[PDB]
Symmetry: C3
Subunit: 385 residues, 3 copies
């Protein structure tokens, strides 16, 4: 059959028949830059054999059930750096490169960490020091760490279904492909809270990470990701990264594509504290900082979204609750990247576990499928004890 690839403008409203083919062919739809691999590839050898089962409603389900019910296109579970489980669906295979959506927020964050290690960014510096086009804007004075914590205080209307929202204006900037358009949008925004006091999920603010990384390194973010990680630990396959315009700027908040085992290798890099062959790519304590759960902080689990989301926020990572509030099997400081339509990159340092889930849910957010994904993941964590 011919590939069913949607219009560029319809990415967030494709019919189910068009999602898998578009999600794995984003380079046919948007401008992109190649994230090059190297010549050495980090091995992912076979590991513990598991057949995880979980209970929901009153019924028991295995892996094929999970994948059928949630329209899952890929599942990878790494234990101790070794493949415990690897499945493909929806026509995907080991060579498929699938798009990240907001999962790439956590990759950008980790690269900011690499830039901190090199001295090229500092958490404490104001964003306008690196990005002079923000001079005079509400972002002037906001720090890099405040951007990482979605706590700039700049007013941001994220609702996609409001034609007037900032997220829709940013998506139209992308579709227009005029370089610097998102930055100009961000520079127009008024301030609403004191900086550092208020969580507002902003896809534009997350994009600012990509802008900062380019400004600090003076090379394309895709090449920095390659030199710091993709070619250094050794991913198996090139990736690629959606840009704002041709040969332009990577979208910091969305649009990275990679093989399933390469998403897993990135997770394994984070699980291993950023160390590749004895050299520290990430600052000492970076992963602890980026996934920190502090009871008094306004980012703590339970405290976001009027109190009815369970997960907190770190440096562009969602943080699982700890202690009495923990979700079953996800205690000990688990954290994750997520993207709409059911993309997950789950890291459990206590258990040395990395999980990657690729999905094509009909709708961008579905609470029952998120909760099912966590039940399935917790059953895998339980079976790997």
């Amino acid at each position: 059959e011919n590939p069913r690839i949607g219009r560029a403008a319809d990415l967030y409203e494709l019919i189910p028949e068009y999602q898998p083919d578009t999600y794995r062919n984003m380079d046919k739809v948007y401008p992109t830059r190649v994230i090059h691999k190297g010549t050495k590839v980090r091995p992912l050898p076979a590991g513990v054999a598991i057949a995880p089962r979980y209970r929901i409603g009153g019924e028991e389900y295995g892996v094929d059930d999970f994948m059928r019910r949630n329209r899952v296109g890929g599942v990878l579970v790494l234990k101790d750096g070794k493949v415990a489980l690897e499945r493909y669906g929806l026509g995907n295979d080991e060579r498929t490169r699938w798009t990240s959506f907001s999962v790439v927020k956590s990759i950008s964050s980790t690269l900011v960490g690499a830039a901190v290690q090199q001295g090229l960014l500092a958490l404490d510096q104001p964003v306008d020091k690196y990005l002079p086009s923000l001079a005079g804007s509400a972002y002037q004075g906001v720090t890099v760490e405040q951007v990482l914590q979605m706590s700039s205080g700049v007013r941001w209307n994220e609702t996609y279904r409001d034609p007037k929202s900032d997220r829709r204006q940013m998506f139209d900037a992308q579709l227009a492909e005029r370089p610097g358009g998102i930055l100009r949008l961000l520079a127009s925004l008024p301030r609403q809270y004191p900086s550092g006091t208020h969580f507002t999920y902003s896809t534009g603010e997350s994009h600012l990470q990509s802008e900062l990384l380019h400004a600090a390194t003076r090379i394309p973010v895709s090449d920095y990701l390659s030199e710091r990680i993709w070619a250094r630990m050794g991913m198996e396959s090139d990736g690629f990264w959606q840009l704002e315009s041709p040969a332009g700027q990577e979208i910091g908040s969305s649009g990275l594509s990679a093989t399933l085992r390469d998403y897993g290798r990135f997770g394994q890099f984070v699980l291993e504290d950023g160390v590749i062959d004895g050299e520290r790519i990430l600052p000492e304590g970076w992963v602890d900082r980026a996934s920190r759960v502090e009871a008094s902080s306004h980012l703590a689990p339970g405290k976001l979204y009027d109190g009815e989301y369970a997960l907190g926020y770190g440096y562009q990572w969602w943080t699982f609750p700890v202690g009495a509030k923990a979700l079953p099997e996800h205690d000990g400081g688990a954290f994750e990247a997520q993207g709409i339509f059911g993309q997950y990159l789950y890291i459990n340092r206590k258990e040395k576990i990395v999980a990657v889930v690729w999905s094509a849910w009909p709708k961008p957010e579905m609470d029952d499928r998120e909760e099912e994904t966590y039940a399935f993941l917790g059953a895998a964590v339980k079976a790997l004890r």
Copy 2:
């Protein structure tokens, strides 16, 4: 020789040496989407050949003379589904894919027919129901039928060589490649007449068919054309369709490319009332409605352009006069698609004739070349009697 391909901005002004090469290489100039063929092809067996000859001035002319005088790059005459004539010129061959200009208006309209047959669009419904971008403009309340009949009554200046004309504006929006630029222009236009009362040929109004089709099916129009026609009856070759923007929206009013016999197959589809292998693709009575001649209607042949044009208008088809006013050998309810610089798709149901003409006239409109084409086609209809 390497191909002589014009700048994208110059499509309506190319010098004669750049016209044939550009018209068969439009995918090297503009963004395009592929119209996929199937694996079965509807045959076009050879019939009894014809060598029609006709008189102009005091001179008699064959097909070769006609081809030379009108700078014809292709002519195809089908008689009851069989090839009575097939000639190529200007360096074209059987595999050449030549652009349609406004001939695609009639393809889009027929796809609207297919959507009516599937219950996805209705002639009496307003266009802004399907196209929210039109709500609050002078198109609000205009019905799908009135769009097909170029009778919205919205003020539209079609003249090309005036820089500030609406047609030039819409071409500028295509050349900018911003998704939705054409719809934004259309939404900015004032009402001039009550709708359903006055014919105004508008290339933007005709594009609305493309936008309506995607809004009702939620798949690219190229893919709807493929599933409904191009892969169902089986064209011999892929087509392609010019877009407003990279991976964007098909131009409903211009810019489809296909081989000469695939244009013939589409004419045959219409001639055969939109049935393929016993399946109805078009509503019963669609072709009749779409080529309607009613003396009372403002659309009747002889009323358009305040009497100075012999042809009337249907559902984006031009209608030939019937009765006493018939042009020689074109009685019985013949109708046609046409495009500037000499493109024709002529359908004579009485005679069971489909004819395709590809030309590269130096100017977009030459009355004398139009008249000579009707004289040649009439000679061909006569020869096939």
Copy 3:
């Protein structure tokens, strides 16, 4: 080896690791059109190898030292049409196509010359005769010759580093890829000096050569260059030329890529007075007018930039002083094209010498390295006497 290619917006600010790869891969960064070669290639036979040496400070330097000191990617010296010196650096070889920056202004000027020979342009005619969208602008009444001499009198701010300059707006128009955007900028500019009295280096005015060439020939400028010179002389390889937009208009002031020996062939065309195989392409006396040094002219050597620059101007060519103020070895009427970061095309008719220099200086203009380039070229001239 994956090339280190910058963001399109960063061309004038790349870090050194990114300059050589980007300069030879501009077709991966901007829209381009191919400049096609022909079927025959004009040979550049081997001559007597020279090993020029010159003294800077108190030190002897040869070709290798020149090259390592000024980060030179290529050097070609032709004497009487024969290769006296040919060296590649920075990873380049005989098939590299390296970008020209402003060197192409002199190519555009020479094509205007070709159009004057064919009668399609005239030096004393106003540019708004050929570009009607400049009627009513500061260019109204400005002649073709005045544009050639950078002497339109239109007010123009070249400052790259000022974000509001006209050069920045031009480059923004380019990045936004909207057809005709540069001409729109040009038509917005106010009058400053009476036309043909003062020299103001204007990248936009130089781009105007390209717009004029297309208006007067009605074919893409790349194809005109091909038919007049590239395919006729016999270049060795295709070139290509940066555009304003995909399949759009060539940038008249920047962005041509060619192999080293093909730049040499173009210089040799100029040196042979614009005749190829007995077919005169440039008007008699064109090279004379285009490189004129006339002490009473506002363009004479020593008059530009309040007398702070040794070189005068001609038809988009820089002219070396003659007489008592001649640079050593550079007397007799030498002239050159130059481009930022160290690109030179030097033509010395008296000595029958053509020199091409390709460099990747860290900064656009470094006076020190320019002076050293002229001392090295002078040493070549001496060695070639």
